[PDB]
Amino acid sequence: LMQFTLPVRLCKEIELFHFDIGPFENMWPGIFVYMVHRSCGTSCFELEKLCRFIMSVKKNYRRVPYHNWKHAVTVAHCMYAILQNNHTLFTDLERKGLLIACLCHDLDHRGFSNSYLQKFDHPLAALYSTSTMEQHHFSQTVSILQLEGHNIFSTLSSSEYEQVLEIIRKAIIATDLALYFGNRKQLEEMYQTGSLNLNNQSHRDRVIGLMMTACDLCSVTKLWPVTKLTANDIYAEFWAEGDEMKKLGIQPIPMMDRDKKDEVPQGQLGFYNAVAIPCYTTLTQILPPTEPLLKACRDNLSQWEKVIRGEETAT
Numbered sequence: 001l002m003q004f005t006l007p008v009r010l011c012k013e014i015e016l017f018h019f020d021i022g023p024f025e026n027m028w029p030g031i032f033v034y035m036v037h038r039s040c041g042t043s044c045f046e047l048e049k050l051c052r053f054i055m056s057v058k059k060n061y062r063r064v065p066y067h068n069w070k071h072a073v074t075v076a077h078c079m080y081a082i083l084q085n086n087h088t089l090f091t092d093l094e095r096k097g098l099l100i101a102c103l104c105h106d107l108d109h110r111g112f113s114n115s116y117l118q119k120f121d122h123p124l125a126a127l128y129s130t131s132t133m134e135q136h137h138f139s140q141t142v143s144i145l146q147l148e149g150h151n152i153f154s155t156l157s158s159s160e161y162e163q164v165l166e167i168i169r170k171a172i173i174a175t176d177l178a179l180y181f182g183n184r185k186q187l188e189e190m191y192q193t194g195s196l197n198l199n200n201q202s203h204r205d206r207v208i209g210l211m212m213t214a215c216d217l218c219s220v221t222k223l224w225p226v227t228k229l230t231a232n233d234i235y236a237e238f239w240a241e242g243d244e245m246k247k248l249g250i251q252p253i254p255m256m257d258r259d260k261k262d263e264v265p266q267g268q269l270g271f272y273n274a275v276a277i278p279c280y281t282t283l284t285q286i287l288p289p290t291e292p293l294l295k296a297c298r299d300n301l302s303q304w305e306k307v308i309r310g311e312e313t314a315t
Protein backbone atom coordinates (compact mmCIF):
# COMPACT_ATOMS: atom_id res chain seq x y z
CA LEU A 1 0.00 0.00 0.00
CA MET A 2 0.88 3.74 -0.30
CA GLN A 3 1.07 4.80 3.39
CA PHE A 4 1.18 8.55 4.31
CA THR A 5 4.14 9.56 6.56
CA LEU A 6 5.35 12.81 8.13
CA PRO A 7 8.75 14.23 9.11
CA VAL A 8 10.04 12.96 12.50
CA ARG A 9 9.08 16.10 14.55
CA LEU A 10 5.50 16.07 13.08
CA CYS A 11 5.08 12.24 13.42
CA LYS A 12 5.79 12.61 17.22
CA GLU A 13 4.18 16.00 17.99
CA ILE A 14 0.88 15.42 16.03
CA GLU A 15 -0.11 12.96 18.87
CA LEU A 16 0.01 15.95 21.35
CA PHE A 17 -3.30 17.84 21.76
CA HIS A 18 -1.36 21.16 21.60
CA PHE A 19 0.14 20.39 18.11
CA ASP A 20 0.12 23.39 15.70
CA ILE A 21 -0.19 22.33 11.98
CA GLY A 22 2.34 25.02 10.93
CA PRO A 23 2.36 27.78 8.25
CA PHE A 24 2.89 25.63 5.08
CA GLU A 25 -0.64 25.37 3.53
CA ASN A 26 0.65 22.70 1.04
CA MET A 27 1.33 20.28 3.98
CA TRP A 28 -2.20 20.43 5.55
CA PRO A 29 -3.98 17.93 3.14
CA GLY A 30 -1.06 15.47 3.73
CA ILE A 31 -1.52 15.92 7.54
CA PHE A 32 -5.33 15.49 7.30
CA VAL A 33 -4.96 12.25 5.20
CA TYR A 34 -2.34 10.91 7.70
CA MET A 35 -4.78 11.56 10.56
CA VAL A 36 -7.62 9.82 8.54
CA HIS A 37 -5.37 6.75 7.75
CA ARG A 38 -4.41 6.30 11.46
CA SER A 39 -7.74 7.09 13.28
CA CYS A 40 -10.11 5.49 10.67
CA GLY A 41 -7.91 3.14 8.54
CA THR A 42 -6.23 3.12 5.05
CA SER A 43 -9.42 1.45 3.55
CA CYS A 44 -11.97 3.95 5.03
CA PHE A 45 -11.70 6.08 1.82
CA GLU A 46 -10.49 5.69 -1.80
CA LEU A 47 -7.36 7.97 -1.73
CA GLU A 48 -8.25 9.62 -5.15
CA LYS A 49 -11.84 10.63 -4.04
CA LEU A 50 -10.53 11.86 -0.61
CA CYS A 51 -7.88 14.05 -2.32
CA ARG A 52 -10.46 15.54 -4.75
CA PHE A 53 -12.90 16.09 -1.81
CA ILE A 54 -10.15 17.73 0.33
CA MET A 55 -9.10 20.19 -2.48
CA SER A 56 -12.75 21.04 -3.31
CA VAL A 57 -13.44 21.71 0.43
CA LYS A 58 -10.28 23.91 0.61
CA LYS A 59 -11.40 25.89 -2.47
CA ASN A 60 -14.81 26.61 -0.75
CA TYR A 61 -13.12 28.12 2.38
CA ARG A 62 -12.48 31.87 2.08
CA ARG A 63 -9.43 34.15 2.64
CA VAL A 64 -10.60 35.32 6.11
CA PRO A 65 -8.42 36.06 9.16
CA TYR A 66 -9.71 33.15 11.39
CA HIS A 67 -12.63 30.99 9.99
CA ASN A 68 -10.38 29.69 7.17
CA TRP A 69 -8.82 26.47 5.82
CA LYS A 70 -6.15 26.44 8.61
CA HIS A 71 -8.95 26.51 11.26
CA ALA A 72 -10.74 23.57 9.50
CA VAL A 73 -7.59 21.35 9.65
CA THR A 74 -6.72 22.53 13.22
CA VAL A 75 -10.29 21.62 14.42
CA ALA A 76 -9.94 18.21 12.61
CA HIS A 77 -6.57 17.58 14.35
CA CYS A 78 -8.08 18.28 17.81
CA MET A 79 -10.77 15.65 16.95
CA TYR A 80 -7.97 13.25 15.79
CA ALA A 81 -6.26 13.57 19.24
CA ILE A 82 -9.63 12.99 21.07
CA LEU A 83 -10.27 9.88 18.88
CA GLN A 84 -6.72 8.34 19.24
CA ASN A 85 -6.90 8.64 23.11
CA ASN A 86 -10.50 7.26 23.41
CA HIS A 87 -10.30 4.75 20.52
CA THR A 88 -12.44 2.03 22.26
CA LEU A 89 -15.50 4.38 22.60
CA PHE A 90 -16.36 5.22 18.91
CA THR A 91 -17.92 3.33 15.93
CA ASP A 92 -16.50 2.93 12.36
CA LEU A 93 -19.13 5.40 10.98
CA GLU A 94 -18.19 7.93 13.75
CA ARG A 95 -14.40 7.86 12.96
CA LYS A 96 -15.26 8.28 9.18
CA GLY A 97 -17.87 11.05 9.76
CA LEU A 98 -16.31 13.18 12.59
CA LEU A 99 -12.91 14.02 10.93
CA ILE A 100 -14.91 15.03 7.77
CA ALA A 101 -17.43 17.04 9.89
CA CYS A 102 -14.45 18.97 11.39
CA LEU A 103 -12.87 19.72 7.94
CA CYS A 104 -16.25 20.94 6.54
CA HIS A 105 -17.67 22.65 9.69
CA ASP A 106 -17.04 26.33 8.60
CA LEU A 107 -17.25 25.91 4.76
CA ASP A 108 -17.90 29.26 2.97
CA HIS A 109 -17.61 31.32 6.22
CA ARG A 110 -17.36 35.08 5.34
CA GLY A 111 -16.24 35.95 8.93
CA PHE A 112 -19.70 37.10 10.20
CA SER A 113 -21.79 35.69 13.12
CA ASN A 114 -25.42 34.42 12.81
CA SER A 115 -26.44 37.75 14.55
CA TYR A 116 -24.95 39.99 11.80
CA LEU A 117 -26.77 37.87 9.14
CA GLN A 118 -30.14 38.40 11.09
CA LYS A 119 -29.54 42.22 11.47
CA PHE A 120 -28.25 42.52 7.84
CA ASP A 121 -31.35 40.56 6.64
CA HIS A 122 -29.03 38.20 4.65
CA PRO A 123 -31.08 35.76 2.45
CA LEU A 124 -29.59 32.77 4.45
CA ALA A 125 -31.44 34.20 7.56
CA ALA A 126 -34.73 33.72 5.61
CA LEU A 127 -33.83 30.04 4.72
CA TYR A 128 -32.51 29.04 8.22
CA SER A 129 -33.95 31.06 11.16
CA THR A 130 -31.51 29.43 13.69
CA SER A 131 -27.92 28.07 13.41
CA THR A 132 -27.94 29.99 10.06
CA MET A 133 -24.21 29.70 9.11
CA GLU A 134 -24.02 26.12 10.47
CA GLN A 135 -26.95 24.96 8.25
CA HIS A 136 -25.13 26.70 5.32
CA HIS A 137 -21.85 24.83 6.23
CA PHE A 138 -23.74 21.49 6.11
CA SER A 139 -25.51 22.48 2.83
CA GLN A 140 -22.04 23.29 1.36
CA THR A 141 -20.74 19.84 2.60
CA VAL A 142 -23.65 17.99 0.81
CA SER A 143 -23.06 20.01 -2.44
CA ILE A 144 -19.37 18.97 -2.45
CA LEU A 145 -20.17 15.30 -1.67
CA GLN A 146 -22.52 15.39 -4.76
CA LEU A 147 -19.76 16.57 -7.20
CA GLU A 148 -18.60 13.93 -9.74
CA GLY A 149 -15.85 11.68 -8.21
CA HIS A 150 -16.31 13.31 -4.73
CA ASN A 151 -18.52 10.63 -3.02
CA ILE A 152 -15.93 9.53 -0.41
CA PHE A 153 -18.76 7.41 1.16
CA SER A 154 -19.50 5.52 -2.16
CA THR A 155 -18.91 2.03 -0.56
CA LEU A 156 -21.42 2.60 2.34
CA SER A 157 -24.96 1.13 2.10
CA SER A 158 -27.88 3.60 1.61
CA SER A 159 -28.73 3.46 5.39
CA GLU A 160 -25.04 3.80 6.45
CA TYR A 161 -24.50 6.79 4.09
CA GLU A 162 -27.64 8.31 5.76
CA GLN A 163 -26.29 7.60 9.32
CA VAL A 164 -22.83 9.10 8.57
CA LEU A 165 -24.43 12.21 6.92
CA GLU A 166 -26.66 12.50 10.05
CA ILE A 167 -23.54 12.33 12.32
CA ILE A 168 -21.92 15.08 10.14
CA ARG A 169 -25.13 17.19 10.06
CA LYS A 170 -25.47 17.15 13.91
CA ALA A 171 -21.70 17.60 14.54
CA ILE A 172 -21.72 20.71 12.26
CA ILE A 173 -24.90 22.19 13.85
CA ALA A 174 -23.34 21.61 17.35
CA THR A 175 -20.56 24.17 16.49
CA ASP A 176 -23.29 26.87 16.83
CA LEU A 177 -22.06 28.17 20.24
CA ALA A 178 -25.68 29.37 21.08
CA LEU A 179 -26.50 25.58 21.38
CA TYR A 180 -23.37 24.67 23.45
CA PHE A 181 -24.66 26.35 26.70
CA GLY A 182 -27.83 24.11 26.85
CA ASN A 183 -25.82 21.00 25.68
CA ARG A 184 -23.07 21.37 28.35
CA LYS A 185 -25.74 21.97 31.11
CA GLN A 186 -27.65 18.78 30.04
CA LEU A 187 -24.32 16.79 29.91
CA GLU A 188 -23.25 18.22 33.36
CA GLU A 189 -26.50 17.02 35.16
CA MET A 190 -26.48 13.71 33.17
CA TYR A 191 -22.89 13.06 34.48
CA GLN A 192 -23.56 14.24 38.12
CA THR A 193 -26.82 12.10 38.35
CA GLY A 194 -25.06 9.06 36.72
CA SER A 195 -27.76 8.99 33.93
CA LEU A 196 -25.32 9.69 30.96
CA ASN A 197 -25.26 6.48 28.80
CA LEU A 198 -22.95 6.21 25.72
CA ASN A 199 -25.26 3.43 24.27
CA ASN A 200 -28.03 6.09 24.23
CA GLN A 201 -27.89 7.66 20.67
CA SER A 202 -29.45 11.03 21.85
CA HIS A 203 -26.64 10.98 24.58
CA ARG A 204 -23.94 10.11 21.96
CA ASP A 205 -25.24 13.13 19.94
CA ARG A 206 -24.74 15.45 22.98
CA VAL A 207 -21.19 14.09 23.77
CA ILE A 208 -20.12 14.51 20.07
CA GLY A 209 -21.67 18.01 20.18
CA LEU A 210 -19.41 18.74 23.19
CA MET A 211 -16.33 17.28 21.39
CA MET A 212 -17.12 19.62 18.41
CA THR A 213 -17.28 22.73 20.68
CA ALA A 214 -13.99 21.58 22.35
CA CYS A 215 -12.39 20.99 18.90
CA ASP A 216 -13.80 24.31 17.55
CA LEU A 217 -12.30 26.36 20.49
CA CYS A 218 -9.04 24.32 20.60
CA SER A 219 -7.02 27.50 19.81
CA VAL A 220 -7.32 28.25 23.63
CA THR A 221 -5.64 24.81 24.26
CA LYS A 222 -2.39 25.51 22.32
CA LEU A 223 0.95 26.75 23.75
CA TRP A 224 0.67 30.43 24.82
CA PRO A 225 2.50 31.93 21.74
CA VAL A 226 0.08 30.05 19.40
CA THR A 227 -2.99 31.01 21.54
CA LYS A 228 -1.96 34.71 21.75
CA LEU A 229 -1.21 35.13 17.99
CA THR A 230 -4.39 33.20 17.02
CA ALA A 231 -6.42 35.65 19.22
CA ASN A 232 -5.40 38.54 16.86
CA ASP A 233 -6.95 36.49 14.00
CA ILE A 234 -10.40 36.04 15.66
CA TYR A 235 -10.55 39.72 16.84
CA ALA A 236 -9.58 40.82 13.27
CA GLU A 237 -12.95 39.18 12.33
CA PHE A 238 -14.94 40.35 15.43
CA TRP A 239 -13.83 43.99 14.73
CA ALA A 240 -14.69 43.81 10.97
CA GLU A 241 -18.18 42.55 12.02
CA GLY A 242 -18.50 45.39 14.60
CA ASP A 243 -17.66 47.99 11.89
CA GLU A 244 -20.45 46.33 9.82
CA MET A 245 -22.84 46.48 12.83
CA LYS A 246 -21.98 50.24 13.12
CA LYS A 247 -22.68 50.70 9.36
CA LEU A 248 -26.22 49.34 10.03
CA GLY A 249 -26.49 52.03 12.83
CA ILE A 250 -26.40 49.25 15.51
CA GLN A 251 -23.95 49.30 18.48
CA PRO A 252 -21.93 46.07 18.33
CA ILE A 253 -21.39 44.07 21.56
CA PRO A 254 -18.07 45.01 23.25
CA MET A 255 -15.76 42.22 21.93
CA MET A 256 -16.57 43.37 18.29
CA ASP A 257 -15.77 47.09 18.90
CA ARG A 258 -12.15 47.83 17.69
CA ASP A 259 -12.25 50.98 19.94
CA LYS A 260 -12.36 48.57 22.99
CA LYS A 261 -9.01 46.90 21.89
CA ASP A 262 -7.45 47.53 25.40
CA GLU A 263 -10.27 45.41 27.02
CA VAL A 264 -9.30 42.19 25.09
CA PRO A 265 -7.37 40.65 28.05
CA GLN A 266 -10.46 41.12 30.36
CA GLY A 267 -12.86 39.86 27.57
CA GLN A 268 -10.61 36.76 27.18
CA LEU A 269 -10.73 36.25 30.99
CA GLY A 270 -14.58 36.45 30.72
CA PHE A 271 -14.58 33.92 27.81
CA TYR A 272 -12.28 31.31 29.55
CA ASN A 273 -14.44 31.47 32.78
CA ALA A 274 -17.97 31.48 31.19
CA VAL A 275 -17.24 29.17 28.13
CA ALA A 276 -13.80 27.44 27.67
CA ILE A 277 -13.06 26.14 31.24
CA PRO A 278 -16.63 24.81 31.74
CA CYS A 279 -16.38 23.20 28.21
CA TYR A 280 -13.09 21.27 28.79
CA THR A 281 -13.98 20.56 32.48
CA THR A 282 -17.22 18.78 31.39
CA LEU A 283 -15.34 17.11 28.45
CA THR A 284 -12.57 15.88 30.85
CA GLN A 285 -15.28 14.40 33.21
CA ILE A 286 -16.87 12.43 30.31
CA LEU A 287 -13.53 11.62 28.48
CA PRO A 288 -10.72 11.53 31.10
CA PRO A 289 -7.83 11.19 28.54
CA THR A 290 -8.85 14.67 27.06
CA GLU A 291 -7.25 16.18 30.27
CA PRO A 292 -4.38 18.03 28.49
CA LEU A 293 -6.96 20.33 26.73
CA LEU A 294 -8.26 21.58 30.16
CA LYS A 295 -4.68 21.84 31.61
CA ALA A 296 -3.54 23.98 28.59
CA CYS A 297 -6.82 26.01 28.81
CA ARG A 298 -6.06 26.77 32.56
CA ASP A 299 -2.38 27.60 31.72
CA ASN A 300 -3.61 30.17 29.08
CA LEU A 301 -6.23 31.55 31.59
CA SER A 302 -3.26 32.15 33.96
CA GLN A 303 -1.40 33.86 31.00
CA TRP A 304 -4.36 36.32 30.47
CA GLU A 305 -4.25 37.14 34.24
CA LYS A 306 -0.47 37.85 33.83
CA VAL A 307 -1.40 40.23 30.93
CA ILE A 308 -4.07 42.07 33.04
CA ARG A 309 -1.44 42.56 35.89
CA GLY A 310 1.08 43.91 33.28
CA GLU A 311 3.58 41.01 33.93
CA GLU A 312 3.06 39.97 30.23
CA THR A 313 2.33 41.99 26.96
CA ALA A 314 -0.17 41.48 24.05
CA THR A 315 1.84 43.07 21.14
Ligand SMILES: CN(C)C(=O)c1nn(C)cc1NC(=O)c1nc(C2CC2)ccc1Nc1cncnc1
Pocket residue numbers: 177216217219220227228230231234255267268270271274275
Ligand atom coordinates in the same frame (compact mmCIF):
# COMPACT_ATOMS: atom_id res chain seq x y z
C1 LIG B 1 -20.13 33.90 23.78
N1 LIG B 1 -18.94 34.70 24.12
C2 LIG B 1 -19.03 35.29 25.47
C3 LIG B 1 -17.92 34.82 23.25
O1 LIG B 1 -17.95 34.30 22.13
C4 LIG B 1 -16.71 35.66 23.55
N2 LIG B 1 -16.69 36.77 24.32
N3 LIG B 1 -15.42 37.28 24.28
C5 LIG B 1 -15.11 38.48 25.06
C6 LIG B 1 -14.59 36.58 23.51
C7 LIG B 1 -15.32 35.55 23.00
N4 LIG B 1 -14.92 34.52 22.13
C8 LIG B 1 -13.66 34.29 21.65
O2 LIG B 1 -12.65 34.88 22.06
C9 LIG B 1 -13.56 33.10 20.75
N5 LIG B 1 -14.72 32.67 20.23
C10 LIG B 1 -14.70 31.58 19.44
C11 LIG B 1 -16.02 31.14 18.83
C12 LIG B 1 -17.28 31.96 18.90
C13 LIG B 1 -16.50 31.93 17.64
C14 LIG B 1 -13.54 30.88 19.15
C15 LIG B 1 -12.34 31.30 19.71
C16 LIG B 1 -12.32 32.43 20.54
N6 LIG B 1 -11.13 32.95 21.15
C17 LIG B 1 -9.76 32.63 20.86
C18 LIG B 1 -9.38 32.12 19.62
N7 LIG B 1 -8.13 31.77 19.33
C19 LIG B 1 -7.23 31.96 20.31
N8 LIG B 1 -7.46 32.44 21.52
C20 LIG B 1 -8.73 32.77 21.78
Ligand SMILES: [Mg+2]
Pocket residue numbers: 105106133175176
Ligand atom coordinates in the same frame (compact mmCIF):
# COMPACT_ATOMS: atom_id res chain seq x y z
MG1 LIG C 1 -18.61 28.01 12.75
Ligand SMILES: [Zn+2]
Pocket residue numbers: 071075105106175216
Ligand atom coordinates in the same frame (compact mmCIF):
# COMPACT_ATOMS: atom_id res chain seq x y z
ZN1 LIG D 1 -15.08 26.76 13.69
